[PDB]
């Protein structure tokens, strides 16, 4: 069997810093959102792609 | 509720537990008055009443007991209370009566 995935992304996300107006959060395998202190949004696409 | 039951209560507690509680943390301590504690006793009793398969023995339950009197050589003491339930899959139901209620 075989599988494939992808994710498109603009380039201005290169070093995009997030203004933590509401807590930014990570989904988890369990099914729970955990809040993270990171300000760079590609830290948050790496997690979701994996 | 207009009518209290152990089915009502044990379903609520279990549905909530299967959703939110691990099997090892389903001990639910309940606060209420002593009129509710009697109502818990009455409901736990009829449920156990329908437990026709088992024969409940005064030896293990000691519902009726022997006390020392002078009116007789074999004097008896009758009385019990149901103060706790234990539903399936880890659910324990205990009571903590406060006078505030």
């Amino acid at each position: 069997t075989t599988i494939r995935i992808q994710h498109k992304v603009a380039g201005n996300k290169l070093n995009k810093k997030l203004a933590m107006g509401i807590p930014m959060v990570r989904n988890l395998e369990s099914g729970k959102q955990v809040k993270d202190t990171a300000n760079m949004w590609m830290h948050y696409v790496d997690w979701e792609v994996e | 509720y207009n009518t209290f039951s152990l089915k009502l209560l044990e379903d609520a507690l279990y549905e909530l537990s299967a959703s939110k509680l691990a099997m090892d943390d389903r001990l639910f301590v309940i606060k209420t008055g002593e009129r509710g504690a009697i109502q818990f006793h009455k409901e736990v009793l009829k449920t156990v009443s329908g437990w026709t398969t088992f024969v409940l023995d005064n030896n293990s339950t000691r519902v009726v007991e022997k006390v020392q009197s002078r009116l007789h050589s074999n004097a008896l003491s009758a009385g019990f209370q149901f103060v706790e339930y234990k539903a399936p899959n880890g659910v324990r139901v205990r009571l903590d009566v406060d006078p505030f209620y």
Binding site: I22, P23, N27, L28, K32, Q33, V34, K35 | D98, F100
Partner: protein, 50 residues
């Protein structure tokens, strides 16, 4: 009632200004269906064939 209120702890604040907290939640989802349509775009009734 006094013992009841003493069952709880206290948290010292520094103002009488409204305070707000962050509420984390859950992630895993199912998406509800709105409708189904035939190959011709016609709607799928419940008393309908495969």
């Amino acid at each position: 009632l006094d013992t009841f209120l003493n069952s709880f702890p206290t948290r010292e604040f520094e103002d009488d200004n409204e305070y707000y907290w962050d509420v984390i939640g859950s992630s895993r989802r199912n998406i509800p269906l709105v409708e189904a349509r035939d190959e011709n775009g016609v709607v799928v009734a419940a008393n309908a064939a495969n």
